[PDB]
Design a protein around this ligand. Sequence first.
Ligand code: GTP
Ligand code: GTP
Ligand code: GDP
Ligand code: GDP
Ligand code: V1O
Ligand code: CA
Ligand code: CA
Ligand code: MG
Ligand code: MG
Ligand code: MG
Ligand code: MG
Lengths: 428, 431, 440, 439
Amino acid sequence: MREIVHIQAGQCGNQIGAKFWEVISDEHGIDPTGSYHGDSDLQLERINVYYNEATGNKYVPRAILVDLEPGTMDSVRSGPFGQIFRPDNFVFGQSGAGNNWAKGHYTEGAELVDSVLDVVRKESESCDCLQGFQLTHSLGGGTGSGMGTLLISKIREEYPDRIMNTFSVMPSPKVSDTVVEPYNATLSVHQLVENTDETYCIDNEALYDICFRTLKLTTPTYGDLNHLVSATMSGVTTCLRFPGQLNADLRKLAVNMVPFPRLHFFMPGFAPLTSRGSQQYRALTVPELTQQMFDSKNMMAACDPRHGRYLTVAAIFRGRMSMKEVDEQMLNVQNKNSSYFVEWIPNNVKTAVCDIPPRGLKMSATFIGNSTAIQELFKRISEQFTAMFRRKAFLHWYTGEGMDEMEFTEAESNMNDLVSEYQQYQDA
Amino acid sequence: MREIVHIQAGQCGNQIGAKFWEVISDEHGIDPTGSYHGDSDLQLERINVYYNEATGNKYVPRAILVDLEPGTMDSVRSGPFGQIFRPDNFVFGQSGAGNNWAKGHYTEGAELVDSVLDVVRKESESCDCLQGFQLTHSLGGGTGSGMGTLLISKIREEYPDRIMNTFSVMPSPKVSDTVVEPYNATLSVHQLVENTDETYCIDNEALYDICFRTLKLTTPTYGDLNHLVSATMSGVTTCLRFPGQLNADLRKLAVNMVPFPRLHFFMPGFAPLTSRGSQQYRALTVPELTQQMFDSKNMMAACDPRHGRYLTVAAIFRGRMSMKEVDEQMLNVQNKNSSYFVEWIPNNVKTAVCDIPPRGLKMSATFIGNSTAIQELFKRISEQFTAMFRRKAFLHWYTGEGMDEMEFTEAESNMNDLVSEYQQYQDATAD
Amino acid sequence: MRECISIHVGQAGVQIGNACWELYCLEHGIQPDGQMPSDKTIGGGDDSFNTFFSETGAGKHVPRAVFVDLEPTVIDEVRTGTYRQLFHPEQLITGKEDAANNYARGHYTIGKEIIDLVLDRIRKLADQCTGLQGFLVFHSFGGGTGSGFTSLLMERLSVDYGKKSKLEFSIYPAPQVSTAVVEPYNSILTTHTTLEHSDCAFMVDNEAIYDICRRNLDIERPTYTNLNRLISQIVSSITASLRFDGALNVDLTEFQTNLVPYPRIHFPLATYAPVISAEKAYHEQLSVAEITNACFEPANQMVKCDPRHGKYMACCLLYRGDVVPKDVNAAIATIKTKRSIQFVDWCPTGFKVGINYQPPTVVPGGDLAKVQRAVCMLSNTTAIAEAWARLDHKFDLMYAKRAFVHWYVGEGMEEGEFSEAREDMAALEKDYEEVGVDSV
Amino acid sequence: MRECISIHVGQAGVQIGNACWELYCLEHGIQPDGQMPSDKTIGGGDDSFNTFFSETGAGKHVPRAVFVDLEPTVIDEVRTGTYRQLFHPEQLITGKEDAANNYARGHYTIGKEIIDLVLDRIRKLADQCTGLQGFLVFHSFGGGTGSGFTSLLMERLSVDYGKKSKLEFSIYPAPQVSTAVVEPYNSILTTHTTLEHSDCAFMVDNEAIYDICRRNLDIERPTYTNLNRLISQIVSSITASLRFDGALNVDLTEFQTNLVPYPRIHFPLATYAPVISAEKAYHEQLSVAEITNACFEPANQMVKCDPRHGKYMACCLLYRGDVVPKDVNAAIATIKTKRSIQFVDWCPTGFKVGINYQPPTVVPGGDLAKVQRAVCMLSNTTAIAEAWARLDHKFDLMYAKRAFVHWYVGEGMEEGEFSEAREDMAALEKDYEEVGVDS
Ligand SMILES: Nc1nc2c(ncn2[C@@H]2O[C@H](COP(=O)(O)OP(=O)(O)OP(=O)(O)O)[C@@H](O)[C@H]2O)c(=O)[nH]1
Ligand SMILES: Nc1nc2c(ncn2[C@@H]2O[C@H](COP(=O)(O)OP(=O)(O)OP(=O)(O)O)[C@@H](O)[C@H]2O)c(=O)[nH]1
Ligand SMILES: Nc1nc2c(ncn2[C@@H]2O[C@H](COP(=O)(O)OP(=O)(O)O)[C@@H](O)[C@H]2O)c(=O)[nH]1
Ligand SMILES: Nc1nc2c(ncn2[C@@H]2O[C@H](COP(=O)(O)OP(=O)(O)O)[C@@H](O)[C@H]2O)c(=O)[nH]1
Ligand SMILES: COc1ccc(/N=N\c2cc(OC)c(CCBr)c(OC)c2)cc1O
Ligand SMILES: [Ca+2]
Ligand SMILES: [Ca+2]
Ligand SMILES: [Mg+2]
Ligand SMILES: [Mg+2]
Ligand SMILES: [Mg+2]
Ligand SMILES: [Mg+2]
């Protein structure tokens, strides 16, 4: 049955997670009360990947909602699709994490973590062929960053052979809540390097630039940012939700996308870039879809791919289109940018097609790249970490929760190594 | 409920003491029988500080009347507001003191110092929250000089953490009562330097001079001298009797005026001094009040403030004026006279305002200064003392009571140090 | 939920408490008898204003507040004032004899007689909280109670409540309104004694407030009533984040993480705009850009100091009323250029913004004009050390001669506690020096 | 009579096995429910098709087949398809999770747990055989199951059935259709492990079948259905000798005697002609000489190589349809002179010829047109070593940087098995060079 168990933790993780369920529910013909009201059998062929079948022919998402404060919990329970969520899958505290990784990972999160693990199991217990876990969170706060990584460590201990995949939102000074966001991010990236198999780097800096530079949105909101996120999450999970010539799962994804274990951070890309209302009166030729997908202005992570090299690429075209012209246009790209693909991994670009497009678009394209250019992201966070840590500024917010400086030193040393490893294959 | 217990001792003590109660009684709207006949609620807000409530809406002063002789006490009982006082709080003897400090401190005053104490305890115990004691006396006589300081010492033993405030009258030969007055004064100043927290120096020489020169009074009597004292006691106690903060009580005054324990002798000033002269055109303004208030001619002490420096100063204006003008004028005096203010005590001049002016004055201004120039007053006593002691004049008056010459030279050398201290801080700099 | 208890100590703390709670009521629609017709949940609820107001079964909304003073005259006015029915009597605590402008009496001689009772009352309030967040402490630096008793209370609060956060709204002494000569002494003593027990302190320089009331409000001779009405506006702006909700409203605890880079460096500088009289407000409306620029005028600051002679480590802008983000962004952009905002090299040069949508209120008969939008800027700048230097220097002038020191030693204190307090002040001044130095 | 059991492993093996068994039925007259009106001995017999079909008392004809996949979505198709009635539930073995395109996972992790079950289900089939000849194993090179599990199966089959023949039908990986980046890894690993356990292996390169489908059938984007329906035509031509009366390649041992003189060099090239689009309503009927000559055209080979630049070791010609010998001899006489056919000196230069009078059957609704004569040429030429060279080079590019190796080491396989397989591959390449290279 290849079931997937979804977890969303913290404010960011629960707002992007709720948008994800609202988007793919629509695509699978489910309504806010969990009853199927669609027209295609393709919508239900792999519905059990993300949904449990309720007693009375309704579908409930295999999702667990986690937070250290009830604020965002209630915003979801009051949203459009808030009623489709199993009421017993809401685990929350009252104290909050104060944008503090330490509180989320060591002190406040320490007491909620079993309540969360109790639901994961109940939910995994009901899985016929559990495939792995999928987690949504930001890295710049405390609950999703600190507790989120604590859950990953907890879950891997009990399911050491299931696949662990995360949608992780990187912080950026252009959309910042607090100044300690680099501290929170660096400590989390060290966890992710060790404890997950696949991480989608969703960069708030990139999301901001797309909204302000391309979409012409003067004062972008998290709703605008999150519209890009859900479109990306829809596309990047298309191969798991619908049947195709390639019946993909998380493990097959990992075995073909990650050549070296630590290098498991992917750049997502999406085309066409649309806005809230949008309009889409002119459809896009596959040549346009393909050329947009690979431009830096369509990257969901602020990295210039030309500054690096693609180790492995994975692309999906959605809608009624000539699979021949998709093949032609994709092979024309590899030849137009041959020097941005490593030559020691033959045939490292794989493309798939699915005739079911997302809501409000005649055709689209999504793309994951395992590219050495991702090193620019980690470098940017590293430089901001160091400017503060050099003077031990704001450290008292963490040492007052039992943390030592050595932990920070350790965390950054491991992230500079990761930058080095990426640099090592840029010159091959 | 910040009660003060008032004590009057001796002729001067009861004289100026009687006029004090006359004046503040008229300000708070209390008649000679103790009924309230005023018009403003501000008169009864702090009435408890100086008056007890008596069953039936009577207001009795919290005063104790004391003297080694019945003369003055019969008279205070027959003047205005004589019936206001509690007849129990009259404590008089009969042997008298003969203007001899030794008799009031060791022998005669001793026989009577217990009776006075029982009345103090009775009044003190009846206080919601006792504040301190204020004593009106003289330093030249025998009773208020000798036994007044004996009382201060006895009260301090039982109330060691309360405030001890005195209105001490200095002797001047222009109003001379007796020749031995420099002895009594020195022996008293030695007690006041050690056993009181704050002493107002009401100087008979300064009072006589105001009446002669300014008020143009050829034959100034004790009644004329005392109208000046009563005007001073009225203003110097204004911030204790009416709503408002800043020196609202005796301890806050002590903390803000006494930078070193021994230097607790204040120079009072008053304006307008022309209480009943013959030059009209007064047209008193905030600027003129400030100017006059800091002039040697307006000081109830024979010292020129420009011969020393102010450690601290407290000024209170009464009447209807613009606060901003007072502020500006008070600033203009400090700036224009900066050389006469120690630089090491920052913001050492505080100003208070009260809406209620004194009886018969559109506006007045009272001044309390802690100035090193006061050593002029102590120097005058010392050299008059030394003129007698050098020749051992009249010592038998005191040795016959048991005193020894060491007691004289002790008080002598102590007051020499007091002058030395004031000079030390006059020359101290901030760099 | 996440309740804050407020504690008002001494005259200044009590009278500022008056101004604040009167304003809170007019901002939430609470009447002087504690009834809130808009509140549809009787006896309780988890509304944002419940962080500061509890609820009885009769629908009364009672401030989570304790007033304390070592003498009754000031609290007696609350007990018989317009809002006498808002508080239970047990919330108003008074002694019979105050500190006499003496730290020693506030911390020991007199204060020790009433401390237990004050803590017992605070406990009562705390037991009614589902998630106590911390305490707000209002006091003066210069008074005997405001310094001495506050320090004693601060120390006891750390014992009974551990690391639960304590914020200070302190009054810094100014000569135009000072009531005691020894106020520098009391100031340094309480500052040294509370530094390690306080997570954040908002200093209000009485001279800054006095001069603003004079220039901006056209008040010839400001009184405590004038100063206090304007202070409560600053306090209302800072606490509004916890008493209101909104899509763009940011919690003060979030700013707290940005405002305090090291434990001892927890003194933010507050600016408020617009401070305008009705006679002048009528005519000119004030845009977001206009009020934002006013926040970088030295003349509008709560503490006298020149921020262009220092370096910023944090800048928070707390807008309130008719304000949309597009305007704020435009304003900062221009400010960033026409101004000299210099940040230390170890922290990002950004402006943290929060926008409450509940517009500002004015007490009837106040001197401030009613405006459609306002802003309070909270910034951590090394420039505030100037206020430390000035206060420290007045201390040095007196202590060199040991002036007035006998009033403290006579109460039990030792000279060593003066040099100790001063040594601390000296380190604090060096601490501000060091955070501003550039990195290697 | 001697029996053959077919084993289908992985997705490619199962889906190709489906296409073949469907074809077998259309060719022999077996209906989708197992009935055979042509067959007159009910529930018994010793006819030539009994080598692939057993009989029940009720007249049902059952394929001697076994389908094994580590995941059920592909075998469920067989279990609910058109010929579902043809198979017994025990003939379909499905697992829980697949090999994840990981040879290691297929051979070591999932393999250790399913091997015994599969061997038992085969034992049941064998027990029903009076004189089993051996096995035909269908699988892909690149799949984790097709490569990882298959090699372990071949290892055990050699133990359980020593004197039996093992024949292979292997799908060689092509990027146009490949699904994983590590398929070169899986190809080298399984080739090294099966080499000693396979007697003869027919490689089909998906690149060749793909282009034949676009060039000759006019299919823009060929899918597995197109690809597979053509592969089963070749497979059917190869196995027709076992299911029909004849004298050439009548048992799995002749396939080696006639095509494999060196054991290690057991990869014959398959060429097939004519491939004609069923959308061509009118087409000229190619002659024996014309279709025979097309056998030496590169475009028609199952693997894209150049036989002109190699040597021959054995050439088999298998015609189906209207072919009299006289025409074949005439065709061979010409192709000798014109074309460049050079045999190894240690071998006779000639051709073994087999003619089956029944012409090729085409699945109705398929892509291929009905023809009156077709030919499959099986030739053991050193030219096929080109495919080993390209595959070995792709292996070398990745293994040089140790890319993706951690996936295999994490299943318990040790890294040294990689170079041990590569060392074997390098030996194979040199074996080909020596058999047919000159100064
Ligand atoms: N802004 C402001 N400052 C005040 C107020 N009341 C007093 N102050 C200032 O506070 C200082 C004196 O402290 P207070 O609060 O009066 O004294 P306290 O804390 O009651 O202390 P004690 O009277 O000695 O027991 C001086 O600097 C005054 O100017 C007020 O209502 N507002
Ligand atoms: N000709 C042909 N090739 C196929 C078919 N299915 C898969 N392939 C090819 O075989 C390789 C993948 O092997 P599969 O059979 O899909 O894999 P598997 O044996 O199921 O292995 P796992 O999925 O890893 O358990 C790729 O080169 C595919 O292109 C098919 O039906 N026909
Ligand atoms: N894209 C996006 N980023 C968000 C969102 N909410 C918060 N963030 C970012 O996440 C970080 C703060 O983490 P948050 O989820 O608020 O904290 P937590 O509740 O402690 O996990 C900052 O970098 C924010 O900019 C959101 O809805 N969308
Ligand atoms: N101003 C003033 N001084 C007085 C008065 N009566 C006495 N003195 C002074 O008091 C001193 C003598 O003390 P006195 O009170 O007569 O004697 P005692 O009763 O023994 O203390 C002399 O310097 C007198 O001038 C009076 O009514 N007013
Ligand atoms: C090495 O290159 C590969 C990457 C992956 C993959 N495995 N199958 C996939 C492929 C997908 O990308 C194209 C997706 C949709 C992402 Br737009 C997928 O679900 C996430 C699984 C197989 C590969 O050969
Ligand atoms: Ca309520
Ligand atoms: Ca038969
Ligand atoms: Mg947040
Ligand atoms: Mg006499
Ligand atoms: Mg007070
Ligand atoms: Mg499979």
